């Protein structure tokens, strides 16, 4: 759900779109995430590992 589960009813939303939301919230455009999605995913997986 993202952040809506803590401010009211839960709303379903794809996780890449939630990541685009969180990237646009800090000033970075959503295109860098919508284009380089595989790189961000691999970096996140490597960090989690």
């Amino acid at each position: 759900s993202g952040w809506t589960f803590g401010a009211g009813p839960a709303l379903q939303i794809p996780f890449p779109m939630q990541m685009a939301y969180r990237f646009n919230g800090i000033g970075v455009t959503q295109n860098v995430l919508y284009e380089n999605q595989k790189l961000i995913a691999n970096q996140f997986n490597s960090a989690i590992g």
């Binding site: 919508y34 380089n36 999605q37």
Partner: peptide, 19 residues
Amino acid sequence: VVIGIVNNTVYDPLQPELD
């Protein structure tokens, strides 16, 4: 490079007014 994108049409506020 965008995954999950679908084909559609967008509107232009200049083409119908110019034509």
